[PDB]
């Protein structure tokens, strides 16, 4: 059993490399971020450009939605994060604290906290309402490539080019776990699984791994794509068949069977590295974004 994603819309607007695409939790919007210093908002179902959100002084590496789809947080080379009210476009807060480029960000499920990761080798935890830094974790020995909260917000997972995934207690800041698999390629992405039991991690040796982080066991690996250089997120597709989705440096989107780890589809059409993908929360829709030789975002839809 396999999906049949087919191309429905191609989106263009950004003038430099895209770094991230994310669907809003309410299904209405796609947000994208770029080295052009802009966030762009697009209609999730028809790909219609909605608006630009501007204010960062340098390129943006990541953007993330709050649980209620009302806010965005962005992470920039200008060493700030910004919290935005999406409907008005207003910058509610600028989060200053990191000493180098901010590379990743996420709200907790309650969307009262933000976690960030930086080239400064730290993870920071911020209060959304006040915009102030609550905690700084001396997390890694190289840039932090991803940060994500678990289901109830009590844990943070971080990944780094130092080759480590680490699990942090949100309240105490203690490093609870370090995951590594008898080799330490750089880790370019990590996130908790939909049910909260696993973490999915991308390493720059062309490999995705699904870990039981409590037991410290790698349960699945997904291979066949190309990923030796860029920060390419990976997704869980939860609306139809249980798939793992990722971009790839051979210009394709890869889709794997969660359980069997076989490739079930490859989506062709981009002319450069597929730097980012996202999966829609209710419909079988994938968004993909390619690097600057291509400069498009594509929306693909499947019947299953
Ligand atoms: C019928 N199989 C399952 O139900 C199932 C199997 C697995 C495993 C396997 N094989 C154990 C090691 C991966 C993990 C989960 N949970 S998951 O990773 O969080 C998850 C991933 C996706 Br894609 C979608 C959803 Cl909805 C989801 O929950 C499962 O749900």
Swiss-Prot record:
WD repeats: 13-52, 55-96, 98-138, 139-178, 182-223, 226-266, 269-303
Keyword Lyase attached: no
Keywords: Acetylation, Chromatin regulator, Host-virus interaction, Isopeptide bond, Nucleus, Repeat, Transcription, Transcription regulation, Ubl conjugation, WD repeat
Phenotype upon changing residue 233 to W: Strongly reduced affinity for histone H3
Protein name: WD repeat-containing protein 5
Function: Contributes to histone modification. May position the N-terminus of histone H3 for efficient trimethylation at 'Lys-4'. As part of the MLL1/MLL complex it is involved in methylation and dimethylation at 'Lys-4' of histone H3. H3 'Lys-4' methylation represents a specific tag for epigenetic transcriptional activation. As part of the NSL complex it may be involved in acetylation of nucleosomal histone H4 on several lysine residues. May regulate osteoblasts differentiation.
Protein's gene: WDR5
Residues under site feature: Important for interaction with histone H3: 77, 103, 233, 292
Keyword Transmembrane assigned: no
Recorded family membership: Belongs to the WD repeat WDR5/wds family.
Effect caused by changing residue 103 to A: Strongly reduced affinity for histone H3. Significant decrease in interaction with KMT2A
One BP term from GO: skeletal system development
Major location (coarse): nucleus
